[PDB]
Symmetry: D2
Subunit: 178 residues, 4 copies
């Protein structure tokens, strides 16, 4: 019935974070936000320089080793648990593995009421925003713009190519069941 967790999926620079902050502002009840970024933040710095962790090549390519996977899995069960405990949770992620990534989340979520959101944005535009934002490693936006959505099922889809974050947030909130 009541939406317990909102999960956004989109390529780097698709506007996920902005939409999330907008959602936190728009939604009447307090929603805690967590995403792959804050996850990286919580991992030890040395994790960005390892095997089973995460590394970014020159052109923005990204690869995830098993060490990273293990931690992420536990982190996933944690946020799910937060929701299970009564806290409304918003999660933004980048499904590098497309549908597989969704399945992974599905395994952790169980019968929890989740609102699956797709955040699209044209590759060239995303790339431009990537430059505007000043992201360290250029190239991610273009590389992730489309593949991350392949085979992924959404309850709602927003496209930031021509819609502001606040507007996308409004569309998403509309589907949130209190």
């Amino acid at each position: 019935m009541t939406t317990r967790m909102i999960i956004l999926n989109g390529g780097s620079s698709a506007g996920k974070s902005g939409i999330v902050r907008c959602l936190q502002s728009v939604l009447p009840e307090p929603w805690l936000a967590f995403g792959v970024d804050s996850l990286i933040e919580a991992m030890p710095l040395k994790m960005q320089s390892a095997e089973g962790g995460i590394e970014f090549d020159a052109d923005g390519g990204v690869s995830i080793g098993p060490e990273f996977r293990a931690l992420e899995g536990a982190w996933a069960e944690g946020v799910v648990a937060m929701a299970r405990a009564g806290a409304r949770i918003i999660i933004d992620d980048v499904f590098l593995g497309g549908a597989a990534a969704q399945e992974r989340w599905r395994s952790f979520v169980g019968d929890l009421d989740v609102l699956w959101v797709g955040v699209r944005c044209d590759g060239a535009v995303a790339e431009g925003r990537e430059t505007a934002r000043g992201d360290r490693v250029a190239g991610m936006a273009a590389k992730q713009a489309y593949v991350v959505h392949e085979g992924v099922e959404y309850d709602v889809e927003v496209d930031t190519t021509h819609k502001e974050s606040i507007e996308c947030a409004w569309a998403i909130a509309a589907h949130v069941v209190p």
Copy 2:
């Protein structure tokens, strides 16, 4: 002949910073960027809590005392000097005083070749972006969206309401004389 300094004026959240980073990326020659933000950054923390400095009320209103003015004046002469010394300078500012602010800059710039840029964006949209970005004090975007341009003369005008930063950057670069 050659453009020595580019000065952007626009309300908070109009997209100035993003355009600046885009300009730095687009322009072939290295352009140093400085703005009211980095200026605040360079001022002592206690300056945000003083008389002659800067304070933000509850609704996003902003006021500048003489202490702030004095420092800013010196900072202005400095960047102008940087340009005079051969470094290409990009400056983004918020002309709270409208035309008066432009005159102030004019006094410091002298006969230096400057490209005056106006960065517009609808108030409501700016406000939305202000929320998306997560700015501490909400209200600035709306309050500054229009007044900062009153009586201000520009060599080029861009409107981020429906144009990406990179696109605005392209428009601006086109007017930059090597």
Copy 3:
């Protein structure tokens, strides 16, 4: 047997974060780090301007309403769950309620193997570091330097008044059971 979660308690500017990063570097196994700061980060911005959330007065005093408490409780169960799922968790917090705060954590932790760490630092010194770091609201360091430890039981205690973060980290790691 094996330590599953490390919980550090100390006043603002006692050096908790630095020690945590050192621990992440020193410890051979990957430890995920979370603390009151990242929690605030995950809460909606408007939570810093509410009743049941968190507010900071002029002199650095801090108060926590029920809205905040509710979220924090769920967040607590989450990290505990992360640990329960096999991820090594490091948590730094500020026990404003002294022993009561420890009891709260005890209720969530259950029989989970936890290493309780106390991070002390002289008030005047902490205050100085608070200034050095450039923290927005001055006054917290002094106000929290001692009360947060009243009635709190620790497995290990470190004092950063005359010990570097890395050194304190070494002391703490020594008590971590693989």
Copy 4:
């Protein structure tokens, strides 16, 4: 007579920034702060990935090309100009070239009244702090701890190995002539 500019030199993680913020707090008159960091910040992102700019190898080594040098030179004349215009300026830098770097600054400073400050800190300790702070590229602290001071003349020297930032700041302020 009156001190117009304070220039601090020290290896990465020697505590320069903290001392600077302390100085801004301690000193009665408003002092603007600028340093190699804010300079990097003002340079285009692509400058960290070029020839004549700045690059950091794997072990924390740093090299500066001519492109970087040119900009820095202009930036130097700028801050000097700020001081010449009546603004009190604080500058923290890392003299990779030792005495040569001081000479460079001397050429730009001219007869301006400057207070030269040396900020020392043991290499091993600095390294530890580098880890505590979470600096991206480890290794700088150790590599720069001593060479940056070779042949460099100071009006005042502080050592953060066993002195807090605030204390070092007090020592430095004592030499500031109003």
